[PDB]
Design a protein around this nucleic acid. Sequence first.
DNA 1: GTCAGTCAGCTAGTGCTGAC
DNA 2: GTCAGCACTAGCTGACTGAC
Length: 627
Amino acid sequence: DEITKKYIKDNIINVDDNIIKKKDIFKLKNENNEITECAFEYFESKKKFDDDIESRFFIINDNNYNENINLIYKDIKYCGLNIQTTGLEVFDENIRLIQIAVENYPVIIYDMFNINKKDILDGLRKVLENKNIIKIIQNGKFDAKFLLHNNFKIENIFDTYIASKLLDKNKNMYGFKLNNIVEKYLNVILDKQQQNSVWNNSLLNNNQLFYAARDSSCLLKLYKKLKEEIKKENLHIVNDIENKCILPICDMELNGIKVDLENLQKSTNEILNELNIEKDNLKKKLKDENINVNSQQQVLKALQKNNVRDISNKLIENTSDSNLKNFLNHEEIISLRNYRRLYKLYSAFYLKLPLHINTKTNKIHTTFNQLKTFSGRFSSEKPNLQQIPRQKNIREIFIPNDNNIFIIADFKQIELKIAAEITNDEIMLKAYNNNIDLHTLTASIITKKNIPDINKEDRHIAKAINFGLIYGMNYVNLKNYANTYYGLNMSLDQCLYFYNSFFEHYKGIYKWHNQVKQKRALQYSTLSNRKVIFPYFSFTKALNYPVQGTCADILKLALVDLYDNLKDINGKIILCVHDEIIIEVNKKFQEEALKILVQSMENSASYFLKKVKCEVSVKIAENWGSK
DNA sequence: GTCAGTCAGCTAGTGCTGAC
DNA sequence: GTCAGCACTAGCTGACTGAC
């Protein structure tokens, strides 16, 4: 229809009219700092949107490109960047539209499908790469990933999702989408009724482009309000850290971690054979060939039929992991426990990994999220890295890329050091000034032995108790904590003596406990001023939030510094799980990489913590499970 | 020849029970 | 706290009797 193809030359298909091609004379400065009059083509909705946000937009395709459009970018301080894509996955999908929003101008839409003169994107490249231009993005991780994968470089960034998430102080989990944020702050409904319209088509209809335009112009108003809201809340440090840490997360997701297919196959074969053998052994032991082991009720019934009892001559009524410890005086239960371990390991890692492995590159790629965790630490999904077993044999599957070598660095006692810093415990700080671990010190006070005489087992008990009592556990739960996660049986009187001895000397932590318990505050702040406001008081989380948040801040600062300091030797930041950072570097630059990693981690530690001095243990690893 | 009354397999949901 | 895996209990949906 002649109505519908009015603007086909610029790849626009009319749906319900509501589109006009209008030209007006603009006033722009020249490269010689001289105002120049230029005529531009911009489209407009025939029906004015009820809100005050802009809806004008240029479209820049192969034909319509005008060289003078690059002058908008000059002498700016913020610009709104949003990109539309055919699908979610970065590897299987391209970028359809790039949008730029410069204040008091329409939104410039670059149609990458109808762009072939590579000088077109030069202005986009320079506005993206400039470090003096605060690019505003919504959900910066997704857009940054798509841009980096296609040879673009984007340097500065300001994500409205991070600002909104931090400002809410973890009040609500859901929300924090573009429509919700704009409604909450600027009092406007974006009418996001586009139900994921088909983007693959070369031709794009009016509603899609206009909805994409209001998603870019609305970011500048959010920038203005969120900047002031953050400034009034003293959240600028953590916001800056998160914004600059967006890009390292994109690097980690893009590069991934390679899996040795041959070793994975060998381990899977061996583990399946071991599972079959143990299953057969249990089958003979349970004396029921038809028995299915996985049925929890059925194994309970079978063990009941076996009539094995307790030390109290009590029949088993539960196969809880700790209840198995109470019933260990038989070969049956040993076989059952071994089978449970093998089954969980097998069907949780070995049979699940092949789905995640991309046969195109034979690498595992993760989806890192940086503010879903309450404490602030990174959380992985799709493949859950923290759920990967941490035993030696399982991790060896992960190898570096061909012709490379891993560097692995991990903090030591970052929680305990941060606790010492915040609580200002004099004895801990005077201890760490002379390089003695707080596990060794805790063991020394517990066992009354001299420092050189401390063994490894005392260090283990210290490892238990320091974590136990530095997050405000009542001494009753110390027994459960030590037994369950470390296996050390303990008596209540021993727990009482340990509690008294621990809080008699480390005075600072006692003062911290007293203050936090007395105030019963509903709001807490970390050393990066990451504020959280709970619904109701909880002593455990009240004690746990500051140290964990500060540890997350230290890791994020380390990644931000590392991503800038590793660009010379072209090292990839691969993963960051727990207090551990992994970088892959070419085999020549091993020494330089080690120095860079250590320096970045130490500087990050020294930025927030001042009294103490963190240390990092770095080992060059052939495989992630190296020595 | 035909329709009730009762016998079920199937699918869901909840109950309950375990570890990464 | 998240997660799968299974009895058990229930309600439904066709087929095997039961009939005057």
